[PDB]
Amino acid sequence: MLTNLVAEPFAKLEQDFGGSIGVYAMDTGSGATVSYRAEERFPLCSSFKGFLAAAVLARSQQQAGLLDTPIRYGKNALVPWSPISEKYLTTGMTVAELSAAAVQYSDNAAANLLLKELGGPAGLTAFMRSIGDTTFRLDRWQLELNSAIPGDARDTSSPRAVTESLQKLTLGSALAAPQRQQFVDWLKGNTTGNHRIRAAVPADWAVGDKTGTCGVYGTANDYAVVWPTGRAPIVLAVYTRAPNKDDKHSEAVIAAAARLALEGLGVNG
Numbered sequence: 001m002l003t004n005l006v007a008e009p010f011a012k013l014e015q016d017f018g019g020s021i022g023v024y025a026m027d028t029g030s031g032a033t034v035s036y037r038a039e040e041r042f043p044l045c046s047s048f049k050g051f052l053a054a055a056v057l058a059r060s061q062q063q064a065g066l067l068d069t070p071i072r073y074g075k076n077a078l079v080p081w082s083p084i085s086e087k088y089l090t091t092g093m094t095v096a097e098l099s100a101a102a103v104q105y106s107d108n109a110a111a112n113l114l115l116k117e118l119g120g121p122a123g124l125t126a127f128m129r130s131i132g133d134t135t136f137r138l139d140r141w142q143l144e145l146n147s148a149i150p151g152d153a154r155d156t157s158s159p160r161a162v163t164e165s166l167q168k169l170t171l172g173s174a175l176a177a178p179q180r181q182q183f184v185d186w187l188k189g190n191t192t193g194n195h196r197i198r199a200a201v202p203a204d205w206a207v208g209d210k211t212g213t214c215g216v217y218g219t220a221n222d223y224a225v226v227w228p229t230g231r232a233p234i235v236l237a238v239y240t241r242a243p244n245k246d247d248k249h250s251e252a253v254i255a256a257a258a259r260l261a262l263e264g265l266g267v268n269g
């Protein structure tokens with residue numbers, strides 16, 4: 001079949017890193033894939049916020065005024081790493097602005113406000129089930145969901161399910177066309193991923209992504225849609241973890257894993 005037609009040295013990369021690397025990459029033209037630990041669970045960390053914004057967009061298809069609704073919040077809503085929402089504490093922000101901040105700056109207060117609107121972790125999980133993702137689970141609220149405990153399935157997904165859901169939302173039919181392009185535009189505008197998948201992608205190709213970094217257990221990640229010129233887009237996810245709480249994550253390992261995935265698919269970059 002079309003999985004791992006060309007072998008790549010993922011095992012040496014993760015051994016040098018001192019942990020585990022999980023990769024799934026899909027060439028949406030031919031259906032060829034690269035897969036390494038692709039069905040293992042890894043912590044989502046902040047990467048859940050991309051799917052949160054897609055769930056908001058889905059709701060907006062049946063609530064025409066949702067995106068422009070102004071949301072006010074108190075100082076108690078501001079938690080560490082809320083770089084956009086802290087600048088609008090005294091004014092409020094719209095649902096769309098909160099969604100953009102959650103995707104593009106990983107804004108934590110914004111993500112918490114939107115998670116509340118959707119009915120909490122079970123509400124986001126229900127949205128993912130509604131698009132056919134049976135792997136994703138969000139269980140806790142922010143700044144508890146990033147514990148990344150070895151063997152704990154809470155607040156995890158697999159690289160494969162992340163990629164499959166990302167494809168459905170950005171390129172498939174899970175969102176209506178205007179909402180689909182809005183999701184793509186938010187991902188393209190991300191500011192936090194320059195040293196991850198984007199570092200493996202030539203400058204003349206379009207790319208959108210969402211990052212995550214738990215801060216413990218060498219756990220960090222990135223997922224992306226990439227548009228190489230002259231061929232069909234590629235969807236991919238790269239997740240890492242490591243055995244010890246104080247093990248450090250590595251952005252360079254994520255970029256290197258993305259390069260290996262593109263090489264395995266025969267995409268010249």
Ligand SMILES: C[C@@H]1[C@H]([C@H](C=O)[C@@H](C)O)N=C(C(=O)O)[C@@H]1S[C@@H]1CN[C@H](C(=O)N(C)C)C1
Nearest residue numbers: 045046047081106108146192211212213214
């Ligand atoms: C803290 C942000 C947030 C995160 C989600 O994973 C949640 C748990 O706060 N999202 C971020 C993302 O850029 O994705 C950033 S972590 C980034 C990697 N080192 C930087 C740093 O100063 N650290 C606290 C780790 C920024």
